[PDB]
Design a protein around this nucleic acid. Structure first.
Ligand SMILES: [K+]
Ligand SMILES: [K+]
Ligand SMILES: [K+]
Ligand SMILES: [K+]
Ligand SMILES: [Mg+2]
Ligand SMILES: [Mg+2]
Ligand SMILES: [Mg+2]
Ligand SMILES: [Mg+2]
Ligand SMILES: [Mg+2]
Ligand SMILES: [Mg+2]
Ligand SMILES: [Mg+2]
Ligand SMILES: [Mg+2]
Ligand SMILES: [Mg+2]
Ligand SMILES: [Mg+2]
Ligand SMILES: [Mg+2]
Ligand SMILES: [Mg+2]
Ligand SMILES: [Mg+2]
Ligand SMILES: [Mg+2]
Ligand SMILES: [Mg+2]
Ligand SMILES: [Mg+2]
Ligand SMILES: [Mg+2]
Ligand SMILES: [Mg+2]
Ligand SMILES: [Mg+2]
Ligand SMILES: [Mg+2]
Ligand SMILES: [Mg+2]
Ligand SMILES: [Mg+2]
Ligand SMILES: [Mg+2]
Ligand SMILES: [Mg+2]
Ligand SMILES: [Mg+2]
Ligand SMILES: [Mg+2]
Ligand SMILES: [Mg+2]
Ligand SMILES: [Mg+2]
Ligand SMILES: [Mg+2]
Ligand SMILES: [Mg+2]
Ligand SMILES: [Mg+2]
Ligand SMILES: [Mg+2]
Ligand SMILES: [Mg+2]
Ligand SMILES: [Mg+2]
Ligand SMILES: [Mg+2]
Ligand SMILES: [Mg+2]
Ligand SMILES: [Mg+2]
Ligand SMILES: [Mg+2]
Ligand SMILES: [Mg+2]
Ligand SMILES: [Mg+2]
Ligand SMILES: [Mg+2]
Ligand SMILES: [Mg+2]
Ligand SMILES: [Mg+2]
Ligand SMILES: [Mg+2]
Ligand SMILES: [Mg+2]
Ligand SMILES: [Mg+2]
Ligand SMILES: [Mg+2]
Ligand SMILES: [Mg+2]
Ligand SMILES: [Mg+2]
Ligand SMILES: [Mg+2]
Ligand SMILES: [Mg+2]
Ligand SMILES: [Mg+2]
Ligand SMILES: [Mg+2]
Ligand SMILES: [Mg+2]
Ligand SMILES: [Mg+2]
Ligand SMILES: [Mg+2]
Ligand SMILES: [Mg+2]
Ligand SMILES: [Mg+2]
Ligand SMILES: [Mg+2]
Ligand SMILES: [Mg+2]
Ligand SMILES: [Mg+2]
Ligand SMILES: [Mg+2]
Ligand SMILES: [Mg+2]
Ligand SMILES: [Mg+2]
Ligand SMILES: [Mg+2]
Ligand SMILES: [Mg+2]
Ligand SMILES: [Mg+2]
Ligand SMILES: [Mg+2]
Ligand SMILES: [Mg+2]
Ligand SMILES: [Mg+2]
Ligand SMILES: [Mg+2]
Ligand SMILES: [Mg+2]
Ligand SMILES: [Mg+2]
Ligand SMILES: [Mg+2]
Ligand SMILES: [Mg+2]
Ligand SMILES: [Mg+2]
Ligand SMILES: [Mg+2]
Ligand SMILES: [Mg+2]
Ligand SMILES: [Mg+2]
Ligand SMILES: [Mg+2]
Ligand SMILES: [Mg+2]
Ligand SMILES: [Mg+2]
Ligand SMILES: [Mg+2]
Ligand SMILES: [Mg+2]
Ligand SMILES: [Mg+2]
Ligand SMILES: [Mg+2]
Ligand SMILES: [Mg+2]
Ligand SMILES: [Mg+2]
Ligand SMILES: [Mg+2]
Ligand SMILES: [Mg+2]
Ligand SMILES: [Mg+2]
Ligand SMILES: [Mg+2]
Ligand SMILES: [Mg+2]
Ligand SMILES: [Mg+2]
Ligand SMILES: [Mg+2]
Ligand SMILES: [Mg+2]
Ligand SMILES: [Mg+2]
Ligand SMILES: [Zn+2]
Ligand SMILES: [Zn+2]
Lengths: 84, 50, 252, 109
RNA sequence: AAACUUUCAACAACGGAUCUCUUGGUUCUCGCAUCGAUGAAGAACGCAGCGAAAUGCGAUACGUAAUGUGAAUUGCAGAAUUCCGUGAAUCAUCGAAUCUUUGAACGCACAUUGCGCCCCUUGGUAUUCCAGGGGGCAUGCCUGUUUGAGCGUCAUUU
RNA sequence: GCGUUGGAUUGUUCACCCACUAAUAGGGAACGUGAGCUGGGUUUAGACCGUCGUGAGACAGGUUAGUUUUACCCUACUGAU
RNA sequence: UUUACUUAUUCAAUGAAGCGGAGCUGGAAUUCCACGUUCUAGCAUUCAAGGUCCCAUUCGGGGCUGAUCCGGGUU
RNA sequence: CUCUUAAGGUAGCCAAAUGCCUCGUCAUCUAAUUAGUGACGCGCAUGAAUGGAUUAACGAGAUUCCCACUGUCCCUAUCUACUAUCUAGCGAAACCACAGCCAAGGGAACGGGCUUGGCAGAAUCAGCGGGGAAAGAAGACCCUGUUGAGCUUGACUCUAGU
RNA sequence: CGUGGAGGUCAGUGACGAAGCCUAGACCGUAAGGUCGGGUCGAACGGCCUCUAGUGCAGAUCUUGGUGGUAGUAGCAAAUAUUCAAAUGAGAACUUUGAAGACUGAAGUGGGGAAAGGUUCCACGUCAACAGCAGUUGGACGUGGGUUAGUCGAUCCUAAGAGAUGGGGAAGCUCCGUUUCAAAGGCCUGAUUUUAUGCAGGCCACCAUCGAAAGGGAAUCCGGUUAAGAUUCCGGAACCUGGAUAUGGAUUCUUCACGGUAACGUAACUGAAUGUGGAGACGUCGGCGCGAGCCCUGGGAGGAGUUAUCUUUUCUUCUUAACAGCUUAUCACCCCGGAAUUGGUUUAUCCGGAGAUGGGGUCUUAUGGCUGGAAGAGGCCAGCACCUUUGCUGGCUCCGGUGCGCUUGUGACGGCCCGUGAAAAUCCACAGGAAGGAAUAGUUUUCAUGCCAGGUCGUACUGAUAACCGCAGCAGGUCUCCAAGGUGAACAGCCUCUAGUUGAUAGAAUAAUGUAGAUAAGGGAAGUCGGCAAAAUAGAUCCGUAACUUCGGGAUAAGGAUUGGCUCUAAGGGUCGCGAUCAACUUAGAACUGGUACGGACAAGGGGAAUCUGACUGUCUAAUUAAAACAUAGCAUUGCGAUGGUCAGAAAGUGAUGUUGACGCAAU
RNA sequence: AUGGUGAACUAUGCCUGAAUAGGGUGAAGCCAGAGGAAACUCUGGUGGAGGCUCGUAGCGGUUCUGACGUGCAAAUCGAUCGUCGAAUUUGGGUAUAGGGGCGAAAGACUAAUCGAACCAUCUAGUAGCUGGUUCCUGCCGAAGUUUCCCUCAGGAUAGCAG
RNA sequence: AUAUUGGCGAGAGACCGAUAGCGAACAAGUACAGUGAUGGAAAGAUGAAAAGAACUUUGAAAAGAGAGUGAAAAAGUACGU
């Protein structure tokens, strides 16, 4: 055993989907995401994991608000309207 | 499992909706580097891993 | 190089007690005004078996002196106690088997059980099946009672510490050979994961001080200093002597 | 012979998955899941099963009239007749002895 | 002598080298200072006449409003050509909005699209039950408000 | 030129004895011969003993258990077109 | 070195319920002792009835005592 | 009586899974026994919970003998199925400096090639295990390295704890 | 000498063809190299003087990519097996239909599920790739369709455990702890109705939350229906919960019912706080009883098969759900009565003056019967009409028997333990007596009937020799339910029914050597390290059985005999009133019989005498060691009386032993 | 070395479930009978015990040192075997995490990884050691010796060479 | 005044020129592997313009042979050389 016959017994998931990152790294019994650290308030990341930081850092999503912050700054955070 | 969580069923629904070949009118667009659906998945080849 | 078994026991992962089937902690009543000044009468409702304990327990129901309700207590049944028997607990209770009396209220030579080490700890001494404490004397000034414990030790306890008149039931239990690994197995299945025991000399040096060698042998004295450290205290800890005990006990 | 299947998704022979093979008006054999049997209510004094009390699962007693759950006596569907009688006799005799003890105490002083 | 083997050439294969390309990288320099409980970064799921993705967006869903430009978009279909016009566009700009489910993530939970409580309102006779709509209910701390606790304690009636 | 054996004990080479025989000669061939076998021994890891070692462990000492992989190529050989 | 004190510190319990000092009553010599429960697997809860005083009336309500006082040191 | 460091191997047991000498000696078992068993015992180096001796029952444990039984053998023969084989279709891998006939010589002291001889004729199929010091793996034995690691101990130097 | 790039220059070359590439064509140089021609090609590039470097490859078991010989080779050989014809098609060993032959043989190759997968389900189209042959077929490809719930699950409860808060620790990420050294509270309502709330009468708490699709748990069944969904749809028939409610009934002038000696009965028949009790709720094994379903079987009413002959024959249909009413038990209990000549009584020896036996009653409703549901359904037939939807028209669906039978449920018991074999949600009852209560009337939604609502998520399919994991369509692995006939002790092996499958690349030959399966004269272990392998034995009945022994065993010791078929004989039972009737197997014996065969296949111990060793059962080196190793019971030693022993933690107002207490825990 | 991730395999404890033909033997308890002066023996039944036993399903894995060994398979296949009602087998939930766990103890197991897992980083770690080290021509052209070294497969030094 | 391998906006280079240069010139932190932490590719070029080969013929079809487009098919999306 310990090879092919043992691989036949693999039908119980150690991890499921994480609510925070969606990676299937949420350890069911530990109730902790091995990837993002949920439910810890901080997002898990390590300076030895530079590639993982790059995978999950700012700019890898769509930046729904941060993408417009810069244009708003350039216009000086104006508040009125263009006023034809 | 036939008794699945709604989250699982939602993921399977998305996978089913995106299990299709490339639309044929793409490959007619002006520049169109796209040749085929390179992200096609099949239940017999690559598992979704949830 | 490895953490030995007796060291691993302290983390309490698989070495915790199997307490699922147990009836609850066997304790005397809380030491209250009624027991401190007079007595209170309870009734023995059931004499039941406790998993992992040789002695049977007695469920004894008392009235609550301050609220209209019943309070069930789990005593360790003394031998001769029966269901439907009235138990009397307090300073003024009679010297009858099953009653709970302060140690200072009983005469010399009284046999008691479930004796409190301190007044109100609800029972610490002579609780295992067949065991008992003997009252060997009183010191009324600076009120203390001298008692003999099952181990033969003499102990001085507060005269307000309580005990149950009689001997713990279930005695003679260890007189029957277990006769079978399976019987030891079922005994310890309901106590804790301490069985079976691998001999240290049957292990490797990494696993145990006694491990290794081209023969099974301890190699150095198995008597270990009291000041030795964890991982070293395997064998006979702080042994005053070894060998087949020839001679008398109760050293003067 | 006709063979049957479980009608629920529980495939294991647990206490809550007991079945009986019944024949339907279609002429065919089918499993019918059977509820766990009821235990008779028992006397609070002696533990014997209470006579005259319906035997149902716990929540079924909310769906039946008072007559099914009681007996017309001083402790009804709580204590059996003999235990109630022993309670009567003990109460009366002990109260009488209390009176006797009180007067004996008063006349011994 | 053929076949076969080997060598060379031509043509054809195999393969993708070379060459020439280059909306990419790399390094240097210069300038600037702007994420988030007013919910960020990140995630999930969705949204187009015909899209699987990338990109965009959020049930107002490849977008709404506003401003500028001034006639497109385009693979097809459709629409329009008044297009001398508050007006095309997958345009630019962007100050008004929307912004599902989440996430520090905030009613409690979450391997559940699980379970409450409060207010306003609508329907079912309906203050109490059920349902629909709208608005709410986290924690630490600060200032303040109100209601309190303590023979901690002052005075006063006594 | 021709033959030079059958057995008891031992993993054994060796040895020794029984017995037949005409005779039971000695040797080599990578101490012929393991993609020929076998694996009893030796020669990993399990285990026991004795002696040694404070010990971990040691012993050309004893004991018990312990995976023996591949040819379809070339040649050689055997046969075959 | 042995010993005392308690508020620091330490241990333990409880829903912090009866602690400490007095006192009433009885007995016996300022002191001592007593001061609600023991045949029985019943019962024991509604500010406790009762007693007493007040009010306010048809419902009743409140105080005191029943159940001593004092110190608020939970033990 | 002593002396080495306290005692000086008792009851038992043994060429025993412990005996070097050793295939010990004696008996028995056999035609023949380095085997077995029973004895013997100054026992290299047996021995008392580092347990001694013995033990019914049990054992996929080690061992000897006997009866039965047999292709284990004398000594091989034959039969069946599936292969191998040939064909259609399908179609890998190991390995490969270049390659592939020997004898001797010399040579890094065992050549496919070099030297001298023998020889030597296309293209091949099934087998085969002599050789390719065949393949598999930067020998695991051994030594070296101022390379480790597991483990041990009054090694050196420390340390949790106490 | 050559390469990438840079400054300068030749106003260098070039779409009239730069660079690159190919060229047994030419020239120069000793050489690194340079130059030219020809072909190909398409956009750039070169000479010289200098600058500069990521500047020159045969190797590194080099890196990446590509390609060979091997080689049309090894091979595509486990799971018994295929064949004929037609249809379709370009094409058929492989698709479809029919026929035939087989297999799984109910511990399935059947019918469902759990985990997992995720659309594989189903239809239409369809074959480039994939299905190591093929392919018209497919779990493929393309396009679509499909999963319907108050009652089945989740949801809720708690389990081992996980984990906030209050606190404490930690530089800190965070750790401890889960009721703790906390001011941790909503729900009743006097009164309030300046507002049923704040002031204000008065009742209860030693605590978040998560944790089970097998534990606990409110309630649904039957028939039909789809290409694919069904306890979900349709039809019918129920039930539960939450709520609202009005009649009828009941109750009250003796206000909160009557009857029975009683056990208790009922259509109802007030009941707050608080308390108590019960259910939820529990091991395993053994025999016995009963039920259900199945199996077997008789009669009859149909349909089919065989019919040279025989066979009142062989096969098949004849069914009845949840729910409801009446009724129905063992046990248990009550009344009468008073028992030795002790009786009753189980397969199992228990019970009785603490009241047996007996007579008469009460109760639980597992369960069964009858009836409703409901024959109108379903089943099986017949006679019809038939260009369609297809429609009819009728008939019958009945009555028994049997049991160490199988499966399963259950009851009353009995055996076992130094083992005595969850919890909580939740529901009910009782005690209590707060309160509210009647007479041109009050009381009762635990009696009947009536009204309304029941959300959310899952629901298709496979569940494996092809839907999961193992790189794959892998002889491996992966939890569970149902379970026919014969032989037979049997869920063994062998054959068969229902259902399913007939899938493993094929064809042809029959060399060697193999793999798997067999046989063998005479000898009988001489083979070999060694009886390795194989053989021999084997079921059942009867006989007989040694040493030794812990008296239990050894033991199936050893060693003998018998066994078929047939025709008989004897014995072993139920029920009813010795007779009548009914019924099933097991045992023993006898005669006869045969190529002396007969557990006829299948299935199925070899035995004995000893030594070493470990007591035994058990355990381990998954993937070279199963042992004498480990464990074990037994024995012994050691520490420790809690301000403790042993052991955790970085620390803690922190932990394990410990729900513990020397008959214990800890260490040997 | 630092910081993380794993108990879907397996090890062990816990919680909640589930699974296990047919035979042999015939323990307590019980009933009847016989012998005997008695004490008490003896017999026949009944019953159905056991970490009993034969043997299925199961769990395991002894031997063939069989098959296969470019496999069906990084552990399988066949036959033969151990065990088969309790220290039994097993699902799910849960706990224990790397000098840590877990271990009826094999240095076993801890996801084909174990005498210290996996992942990333420190890290292009160091190597007196092995391998490789890319154009042409021309001229000159060695050393394996001296001394010192924790040196003896290395270096410094002198020598030889440009 | 100083720092700035992150962000935003710019200007550059004796830098690399698709096995180079960031891992990623492209739907690249993508596909895919792993339970997980993590690991992590390959992959640019028809032509000026699709003018992407009408039509005929052989074939069941894929395709072929012609014809045609184009400067070139010695450019046919299996596309520069
Ligand atoms: K040792
Ligand atoms: K009743
Ligand atoms: K090591
Ligand atoms: K078996
Ligand atoms: Mg492993
Ligand atoms: Mg887990
Ligand atoms: Mg515990
Ligand atoms: Mg022990
Ligand atoms: Mg042991
Ligand atoms: Mg060992
Ligand atoms: Mg050690
Ligand atoms: Mg030591
Ligand atoms: Mg050893
Ligand atoms: Mg009733
Ligand atoms: Mg938002
Ligand atoms: Mg040799
Ligand atoms: Mg050889
Ligand atoms: Mg070999
Ligand atoms: Mg050899
Ligand atoms: Mg060997
Ligand atoms: Mg060894
Ligand atoms: Mg020694
Ligand atoms: Mg001696
Ligand atoms: Mg000797
Ligand atoms: Mg001997
Ligand atoms: Mg011999
Ligand atoms: Mg001794
Ligand atoms: Mg010894
Ligand atoms: Mg065994
Ligand atoms: Mg030669
Ligand atoms: Mg020579
Ligand atoms: Mg050679
Ligand atoms: Mg020659
Ligand atoms: Mg030739
Ligand atoms: Mg060969
Ligand atoms: Mg060879
Ligand atoms: Mg080497
Ligand atoms: Mg090596
Ligand atoms: Mg050196
Ligand atoms: Mg070291
Ligand atoms: Mg360069
Ligand atoms: Mg040119
Ligand atoms: Mg050439
Ligand atoms: Mg060009
Ligand atoms: Mg270079
Ligand atoms: Mg090269
Ligand atoms: Mg070279
Ligand atoms: Mg190479
Ligand atoms: Mg390569
Ligand atoms: Mg072949
Ligand atoms: Mg083969
Ligand atoms: Mg086959
Ligand atoms: Mg067919
Ligand atoms: Mg068969
Ligand atoms: Mg068959
Ligand atoms: Mg299909
Ligand atoms: Mg094929
Ligand atoms: Mg094909
Ligand atoms: Mg076709
Ligand atoms: Mg499809
Ligand atoms: Mg349900
Ligand atoms: Mg915590
Ligand atoms: Mg929950
Ligand atoms: Mg359940
Ligand atoms: Mg279906
Ligand atoms: Mg319906
Ligand atoms: Mg009535
Ligand atoms: Mg009676
Ligand atoms: Mg069963
Ligand atoms: Mg279904
Ligand atoms: Mg299904
Ligand atoms: Mg199936
Ligand atoms: Mg798969
Ligand atoms: Mg039979
Ligand atoms: Mg023969
Ligand atoms: Mg013969
Ligand atoms: Mg013979
Ligand atoms: Mg021999
Ligand atoms: Mg021989
Ligand atoms: Mg021999
Ligand atoms: Mg054999
Ligand atoms: Mg016999
Ligand atoms: Mg014997
Ligand atoms: Mg053993
Ligand atoms: Mg092994
Ligand atoms: Mg083995
Ligand atoms: Mg042992
Ligand atoms: Mg697990
Ligand atoms: Mg057995
Ligand atoms: Mg096997
Ligand atoms: Mg083998
Ligand atoms: Mg082979
Ligand atoms: Mg070892
Ligand atoms: Mg380097
Ligand atoms: Mg020269
Ligand atoms: Mg060297
Ligand atoms: Mg690149
Ligand atoms: Mg290139
Ligand atoms: Mg891994
Ligand atoms: Mg290209
Ligand atoms: Mg051209
Ligand atoms: Zn996450
Ligand atoms: Zn009772």
């Amino acid at each position: 055993g310990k090879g092919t016959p043992s691989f036949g017994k693999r039908h119980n998931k150690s991890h499921t989907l994480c609510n925070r990152c969606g990676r299937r790294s949420f350890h069911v019994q530990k109730k902790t995401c091995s990837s993002c650290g949920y439910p810890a308030a901080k997002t898990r990341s390590y300076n030895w994991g530079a590639k993982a930081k790059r995978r999950h850092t700012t700019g890898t999503g769509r930046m729904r608000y941060l993408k417009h912050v810069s244009r708003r700054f350039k216009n000086g955070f104006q508040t009125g309207s263009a006023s034809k | 499992a036939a008794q699945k969580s709604f989250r699982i069923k939602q993921k399977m629904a998305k996978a089913k909706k995106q299990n299709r070949p490339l639309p044929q009118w793409i490959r007619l667009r002006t520049n169109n580097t796209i040749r085929y659906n390179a992200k096609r998945r099949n239940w017999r080849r690559t598992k979704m891993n949830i | 190089g490895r953490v030995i078994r007796n060291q691993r026991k302290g983390a309490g992962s698989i070495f915790t007690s199997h307490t699922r089937l147990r009836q609850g902690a066997a304790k005397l009543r809380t030491l209250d005004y009624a027991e401190r000044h007079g007595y209170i009468r309870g009734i023995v409702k059931q004499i039941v078996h406790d998993s992992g304990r040789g002695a049977p327990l007695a469920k004894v129901v008392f009235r609550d002196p301050y609220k209209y309700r019943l309070r069930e207590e789990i005593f360790i049944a003394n031998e001769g106690v029966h269901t439907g028997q009235f138990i009397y607990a307090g300073k003024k209770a009679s010297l009858n088997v099953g009653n709970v009396l302060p140690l200072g209220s009983v005469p010399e030579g009284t046999i008691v059980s479930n004796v409190e080490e301190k007044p109100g700890d609800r029972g610490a001494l002579a609780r295992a099946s067949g065991n008992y404490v003997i009252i060997i004397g009183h010191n009324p000034d600076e009120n203390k009672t001298r008692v003999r414990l099952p181990s033969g030790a003499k102990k001085v306890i507060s005269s307000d510490a309580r005990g149950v008149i009689g001997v713990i039931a279930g005695g003679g239990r260890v007189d029957k050979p277990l006769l079978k690994a399976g019987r030891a197995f079922h005994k310890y299945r309901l106590k804790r994961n301490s069985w079976p025991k691998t001999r240290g000399v049957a292990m490797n040096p990494v696993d145990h001080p006694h491990g290794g060698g081209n023969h099974q042998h301890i190699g150095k004295a198995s008597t270990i200093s009291r000041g030795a450290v964890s991982g070293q205290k395997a064998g006979l800890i702080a042994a005053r002597r070894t060998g087949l005990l020839r001679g008398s006990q109760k050293t003067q | 012979a006709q063979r049957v299947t479980f009608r629920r998704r529980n495939p294991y022979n647990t206490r809550s998955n007991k079945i009986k093979v019944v024949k339907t008006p279609g002429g065919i054999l089918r499993a019918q899941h059977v509820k766990k049997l009821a235990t008779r209510p028992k006397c609070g004094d002696c533990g014997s099963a209470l006579q005259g009390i319906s035997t149902l699962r716990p929540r079924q007693y909310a769906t039946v009239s008072k007559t099914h759950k009681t007996v017309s006596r001083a402790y009804g569907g709580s204590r059996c007749a003999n235990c109630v009688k022993e309670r009567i006799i003990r109460a009366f005799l002990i109260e009488e002895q209390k009176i006797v003890k009180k007067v004996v105490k008063e006349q011994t002083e």
